[PDB]
């Protein structure tokens, strides 16, 4: 709201206990910066702080608040970027979350082209867990992709942007991750996230590969309508490839659920 944000003692962290740092990046909404929180009672923890940019509007604030509240409703899980604290009173809002020192999975996977066969499946399993969790919390990500997966210093995959309140905007095209029903019928479901997870799996087995390179939107919709499915990556069992194709099944009910995926991948990680 305009003059003062709602109070919640549970999450509030005294601004003096937070020391803002080197910005991690930015976007339309606002801005994220590295920082150092104290006693989340006198030990410094590194965190990422999201906040509004100086050109923000009441709605931009309203979106950052909604994003914080949603993270609050959802709850904690090892495989998602968790809420750690918040400075809401007397000053700009600060959404304090977990810090992922190795950036998103795409960048992670490319700098290491050195992961093992178990590691690649281990990474896919952790992303499936987090999604199962978000799904058990009624959460529909709608933009699952390696970019929205962040990796910690200890290599823990963490789903990001799951609580975020132009088919041509890039520099890859996010529509390339979209389930046909969500892209044609605007039908966003937990199953559509399962489609996007397939495209993510492929990103894992191509070590940061770019899906449909050189293929513009109009062309993508055509391949989709023609039932075309990306080729099986080199270094990826026919089994893991069935899983990708499984997730890319036209009929959303026929695609596997995140719970099943977590199960299959559990097993596969063991048989790797």
Ligand X SMILES: CCN(CC)CCCCNc1ncc2cc(-c3cc(OC)cc(OC)c3)c(NC(=O)NC(C)(C)C)nc2n1
Binders of its own copies in range 206-225 (CB under 8 A): 206, 209, 212-216, 219-220, 222-223
- Taking the complex as a whole, the smallest distance from the CB of residue 258 to its own copies amounts, in Å, to 26
Q: Considering beta carbons, is residue 4 or 231 the nearer one to its own copies? A: 231
Interaction of residue 201 with its own copies, rule CB under 8 A: no
203's contact among its own copies, ligand X, none, with CB below 5 to 8 A by partner kind, is none
The 3-class SS string of the chain reads CCCCCCCCCCCECCHHHEEEEEEEEECCCEEEEEEEEECCCCCEEEEEEEEECCCCCHHHHHHHHHHHHHHHHHCCCCCECCEEEEECCCCCCEEEEECCCCCEHHHHHHCCCCCCHHHHHHHHHHHHHHHHHHHHCCCCCCCCCHHHEEECCCCCEEECCCCCCCCCCCCCCHHHHCCHHHHHCCCCCHHHHHHHHHHHHHHHHCCCCCCCCCCCHHHHHHHHHCCCCCCCCCCCCHHHHHHHHHHCCCCCCCCCCHHHHHHHHHHHHHCC
Q: Considering beta carbons, is residue 94 or 177 the nearer one to its own copies? A: 177
- Taking the complex as a whole, the smallest distance from the CB of residue 27 to ligand X amounts, in Å, to 5
Q: Considering beta carbons, is residue 89 or 237 the nearer one to ligand X? A: 89
Contact between 51 and 95 under an 8 Å Cβ cutoff? The reply is: yes
Contact between 146 and 203 under an 8 Å Cβ cutoff? The reply is: yes
Contact between 53 and 31 under an 8 Å Cβ cutoff? The reply is: yes
User: Is 8 a known active-site residue?
Assistant: no
Q: Which of 8, 16, 63, 143 is catalytic?
A: 143
150's contact among ligand X, its own copies, none, with CB below 5 to 8 A by partner kind, is ligand X
Q: Considering beta carbons, is residue 24 or 40 the nearer one to ligand X? A: 24
Sheet of strand 94-98: strand arrangement: 18-26, 30-38, 44-52, 94-98, 83-87
Of 106-114, 124-132, 179-187, 229-237, the segment contacting its own copies by CB under 8 A is 229-237
Contact between 1 and 77 under an 8 Å Cβ cutoff? The reply is: no
Q: Of 77, 233, 246, 257, which lies in the binding site for its own copies, with binding defined by CB under 8 A?
A: 233
Identify the residue whose tokens are 């719970």: 259
219's contact among its own copies, ligand X, none, with CB below 5 to 8 A by partner kind, is its own copies
Provide the mask over 238-267, with x wherever binding to its own copies is found by CB under 8 A and - wherever it is not. Answer: ---x--------------------------
40's contact among ligand X, its own copies, none, with CB below 5 to 8 A by partner kind, is none
- Taking the complex as a whole, the smallest distance from the CB of residue 234 to its own copies amounts, in Å, to 4
Name the site residues for ligand X (rule: CB under 6 A): 24-27, 32, 48, 50, 67, 81, 95, 97, 99-103, 107, 150, 160-163
Q: Considering beta carbons, is residue 195 or 241 the nearer one to its own copies? A: 241
Residues serving a catalytic function are: 143
What residues line the site for its own copies (CB under 8 A)?
206, 209, 212-216, 219-220, 222-223, 228, 231-234, 236, 241
């Amino acid at each position: 709201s305009e003059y003062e944000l709602p109070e919640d003692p549970r999450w509030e962290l005294p601004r003096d206990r937070l020391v803002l740092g080197k910005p991690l990046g930015e976007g339309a909404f606002g801005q994220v910066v590295l920082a150092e929180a104290i006693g989340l009672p006198n030990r410094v923890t590194k965190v990422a702080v999201k906040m509004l940019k100086s050109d923000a509007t009441e709605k931009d604030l309203s979106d950052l608040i909604s994003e914080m509240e949603m993270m609050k409703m959802i709850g904690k899980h090892k495989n998602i970027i968790n809420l750690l604290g918040a400075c809401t009173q007397d000053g700009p809002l600060y959404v304090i979350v977990e810090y992922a020192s190795k950036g998103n999975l795409r960048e992670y996977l490319q700098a290491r082209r050195q992961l093992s066969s178990k590691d690649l499946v281990s990474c896919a399993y952790q992303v499936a867990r987090g999604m199962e969790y978000l799904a058990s919390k009624k959460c529909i990500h709608r933009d699952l992709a390696a970019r929205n997966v962040l990796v910690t210093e200890d290599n823990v995959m963490k789903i990001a942007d799951f609580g975020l309140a132009d088919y041509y905007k890039k520099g890859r095209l996010p529509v390339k991750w979209m389930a046909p029903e969500a892209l044609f019928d605007r039908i966003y479901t937990h199953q559509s996230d399962v489609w996007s997870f397939g495209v993510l799996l492929w990103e894992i087995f191509t070590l940061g590969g770019s899906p449909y390179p050189g293929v513009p939107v109009e062309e993508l919709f055509k391949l989709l309508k023609e039932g075309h499915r990306m080729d099986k990556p080199s270094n990826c069992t026919n089994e893991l490839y069935m899983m990708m194709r499984d997730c890319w099944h036209a009929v959303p009910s026929q695609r596997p659920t995140f719970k099943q995926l977590v199960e299959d991948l559990d097993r596969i990680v063991a048989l790797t």
